[PDB]
Amino acid sequence: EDHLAKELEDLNKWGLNIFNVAGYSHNRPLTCIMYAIFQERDLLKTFRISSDTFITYMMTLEDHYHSDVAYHNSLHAADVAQSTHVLLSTPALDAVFTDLEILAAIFAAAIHDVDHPGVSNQFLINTNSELALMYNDESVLENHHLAVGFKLLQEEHCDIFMNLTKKQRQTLRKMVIDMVLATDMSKHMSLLADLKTMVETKKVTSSGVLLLDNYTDRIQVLRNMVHCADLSNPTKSLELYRQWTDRIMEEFFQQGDKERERGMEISPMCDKHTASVEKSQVGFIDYIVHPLWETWADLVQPDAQDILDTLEDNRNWYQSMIP
Numbered sequence: 001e002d003h004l005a006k007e008l009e010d011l012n013k014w015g016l017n018i019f020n021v022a023g024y025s026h027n028r029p030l031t032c033i034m035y036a037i038f039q040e041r042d043l044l045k046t047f048r049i050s051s052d053t054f055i056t057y058m059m060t061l062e063d064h065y066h067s068d069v070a071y072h073n074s075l076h077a078a079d080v081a082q083s084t085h086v087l088l089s090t091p092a093l094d095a096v097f098t099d100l101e102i103l104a105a106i107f108a109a110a111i112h113d114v115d116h117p118g119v120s121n122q123f124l125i126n127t128n129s130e131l132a133l134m135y136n137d138e139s140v141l142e143n144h145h146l147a148v149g150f151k152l153l154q155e156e157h158c159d160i161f162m163n164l165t166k167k168q169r170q171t172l173r174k175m176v177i178d179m180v181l182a183t184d185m186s187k188h189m190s191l192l193a194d195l196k197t198m199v200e201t202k203k204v205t206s207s208g209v210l211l212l213d214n215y216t217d218r219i220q221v222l223r224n225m226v227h228c229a230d231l232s233n234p235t236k237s238l239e240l241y242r243q244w245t246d247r248i249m250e251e252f253f254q255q256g257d258k259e260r261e262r263g264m265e266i267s268p269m270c271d272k273h274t275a276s277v278e279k280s281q282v283g284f285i286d287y288i289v290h291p292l293w294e295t296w297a298d299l300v301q302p303d304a305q306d307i308l309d310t311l312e313d314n315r316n317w318y319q320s321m322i323p
């Protein structure tokens with residue numbers, strides 16, 4: 001109550017604690033943070049989005065995340081949205097994005113895992129699920145989250161974009177699709193290689209502010225930004241990181257139990273009888289998270305040096321828990 005307002009004082013910081021905001025908002029973290037973010041940035045006024053309309057959409061979207069899924073519930077969406085809100089303010093990216101691109105990136109973060117069933121694209125494909133038949137095995141979940149999110153906008157009592165122009169709605173839809181499809185982990189290596197080429201030919205104004213000429217370059221940075229926000233758990237304080245680790249392992253091990261029940265091969269990091277939680281996090285940091293943030297740090301230096309220091313410290317803690 002007064003605790004919620006104290007926690008939200010850190011709305012614009014990496015140290016914000018989304019678990020605390022959840023506790024004080026009737027477990028509506030996503031509705032809560034999305035509303036705090038939009039007010040802070042004056043987006044409701046800029047795009048003449050009604051408050052009732054915005055709240056009804058957000059509450060419906062949030063009720064569409066599954067509360068019995070350990071990691072991919074509404075708290076993860078809320079976290080990715082809050083993280084993207086901070087990354088958009090990085091000094092190196094100052095005045096680089098339009099208001100429509102800022103709106104799109106934050107909206108993408110919010111809907112980006114909606115209706116997640118708690119199993120991976122590969123699981124959905126090997127069990128011949130209806131979702132995989134629908135999407136022909138390509139970015140199964142991601143196409144689905146986009147579909148639900150944009151579906152809910154089709155209803156007057158819920159169209160938060162009704163006061164944008166047709167032209168603006170089209171551009172936003174293109175940008176959002178692009179950004180959510182980029183959260184598909186099987187696209188990670190591709191995305192990182194492209195981000196490394198963008199750093200290679202990085203250009204800044206006289207005062208260290210990125211120069212982004214075309215739409216192409218702007219959406220490439222936005223794509224990568226949402227993807228970093230998705231893979232930001234290890235760059236947060238150790239206390240936060242460990243609760244996120246606990247949740248993803250719970251979810252991955254539940255998938256492993258379903259794999260065993262059906263006589264399918266068990267995905268090794270989903271096998272609770274053999275997988276080391278600690279080794280898996282160190283591997284995840286060394287091979288995926290660090291390589292990504294090291295590159296993001298290059299693009300916006302020295303803005304993300306503390307984020308990298310926290311990461312390297314967290315990496316060493318998981319390492320020390322391994323005998």
Ligand SMILES: COc1ccc([C@H]2CNC(=O)C2)cc1OC1CCCC1
Nearest residue numbers: 185233244245248252269280281284
């Ligand atoms: C907190 O950790 C993790 C946080 C987030 C993810 C995303 C990528 N895959 C997912 O399904 C979501 C994986 C994590 O750890 C997994 C890889 C290493 C062990 C588990």
Ligand SMILES: [Mg+2]
Nearest residue numbers: 112113183184
């Ligand atoms: Mg996802």
Ligand SMILES: [Zn+2]
Nearest residue numbers: 112113183230
């Ligand atoms: Zn996600």
